[PDB]
Amino acid sequence: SSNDNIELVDFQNIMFYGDAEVGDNQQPFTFILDTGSANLWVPSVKCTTAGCLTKHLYDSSKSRTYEKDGTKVEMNYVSGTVSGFFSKDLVTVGNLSLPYKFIEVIDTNGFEPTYTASTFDGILGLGWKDLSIGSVDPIVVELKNQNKIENALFTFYLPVHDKHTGFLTIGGIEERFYEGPLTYEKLNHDLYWQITLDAHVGNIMLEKANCIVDSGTSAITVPTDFLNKMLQNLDVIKVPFLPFYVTLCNNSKLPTFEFTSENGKYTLEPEYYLQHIEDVGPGLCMLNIIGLDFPVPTFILGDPFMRKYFTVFDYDNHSVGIALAKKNL
Numbered sequence: 088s089s090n091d092n093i094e095l096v097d098f099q100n101i102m103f104y105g106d107a108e109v110g111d112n113q114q115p116f117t118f119i120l121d122t123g124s125a126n127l128w129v130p131s132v133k134c135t136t137a138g139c140l141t142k143h144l145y146d147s148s149k150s151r152t153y154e155k156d157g158t159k160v161e162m163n164y165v166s167g168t169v170s171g172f173f174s175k176d177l178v179t180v181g182n183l184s185l186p187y188k189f190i191e192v193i194d195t196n197g198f199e200p201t202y203t204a205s206t207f208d209g210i211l212g213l214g215w216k217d218l219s220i221g222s223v224d225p226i227v228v229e230l231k232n233q234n235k236i237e238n239a240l241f242t243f244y245l246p247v248h249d250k251h252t253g254f255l256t257i258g259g260i261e262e263r264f265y266e267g268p269l270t271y272e273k274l275n276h277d278l279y280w281q282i283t284l285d286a287h288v289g290n291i292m293l294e295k296a297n298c299i300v301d302s303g304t305s306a307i308t309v310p311t312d313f314l315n316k317m318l319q320n321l322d323v324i325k326v327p328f329l330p331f332y333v334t335l336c337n338n339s340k341l342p343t344f345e346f347t348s349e350n351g352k353y354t355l356e357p358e359y360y361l362q363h364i365e366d367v368g369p370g371l372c373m374l375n376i377i378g379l380d381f382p383v384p385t386f387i388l389g390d391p392f393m394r395k396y397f398t399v400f401d402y403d404n405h406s407v408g409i410a411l412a413k414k415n416l
């Protein structure tokens with residue numbers, strides 16, 4: 088391709104990962120590629136937590152292009168603080184490289200057990216500058232500024248468990264990934280990749296909902312009240328202690344999400360949001376949906392949505408494009 092393509096690998100229909108390198112010696116790492124964050128986080132050889140001892144670690148002393156920064160970073164997560172400091176070095180994504188400012192992580196203890204229990208080393212954000220710590224221009228913006236690509240956009244063709252591989256593509260939109268019309272939705276903020284869509288599920292509706300397209304979220308998230316309502320009398324239950332909302336895989340009462348704009352209509356049928364849990368019971372499924380409240384009514388269109396729809400993230404035009412993903416590649 089004329090474009091930069093990074094192959095994506097599915098992990099049990101839970102999350103996907105991509106590889107990238109840091110340092111002019113091309114130190115390898117596995118990353119979460121997250122449109123819902125806006126920094127690049129890389130664990131240091133200087134990190135001595137139990138979590139880091141299992142990871143690929145970054146050694147700045149081995150890179151000729153390392154440029155010291157040192158500005159301290161402290162961020163609060165779930166299990167406490169994650170801390171480190173800014174560094175600059177060559178970051179290689181696919182066949183493109185550039186010197187880039189990233190967070191060199193010294194203490195990961197605030198990211199446990201998630202961090203220890205996962206097979207990735209780092210997080211590479213793909214959101215907007217205003218979402219970032221330290222006002223860092225996004226990688227794709229920086230690549231365009233340097234004439235390494237002709238459009239400041241990237242696309243996601245997500246891998247599908249037991250079906251096909253996935254690609255993150257930087258710089259252009261490739262026909263091999265989609266079918267039918269590509270429709271564009273304007274961003275309502277340059278922060279997350281957030282757009283305004285009318286949401287309908289059965290009789291329940293939310294006009295002009297804030298919908299965040301988020302590659303690092305493994306579920307669809309729905310306002311709690313909206314969820315509670317839409318599942319009433321559907322033969323969907325919670326078991327004393329197993330997998331959250333469960334249902335028979337062949338349940339005909341299961342609804343289709345419908346999101347609309349003046350530009351387009353996007354639907355998510357049960358086949359896209361159901362996860363088989365056959366090992367716990369014949370014909371049993373879990374609904375890959377969670378209830379989550381934001382200060383304003385908001386849906387997170389995470390991986391289940393992005394598996395059905397090819398997505399285009401356009402910094403130049405401040406928009407997200409959406410098209411049906413080709414079923415095979």
Ligand SMILES: CCCCCc1ccc(C(=O)N(Cc2ccc(-c3ccc(C(=O)N4CCCCC4)cc3)cc2)C2CCN(Cc3ccccn3)CC2)nc1
Nearest residue numbers: 101102119123124128129130192201204205208209210303
């Ligand atoms: C050395 C690495 C240092 C990482 C430091 C770090 C930690 C957390 C986040 C973060 O907030 N993230 C990034 C993050 C990405 C992926 C994950 C993640 C996803 C899946 C998995 C996973 O595969 N498994 C399966 C194995 C066990 C662990 C879970 C692990 C981690 C966690 C956190 C959030 C997630 C929620 N996002 C959505 C959102 C949008 C709008 C409002 C609120 N929230 C915002 C960004 N950033 C950086």
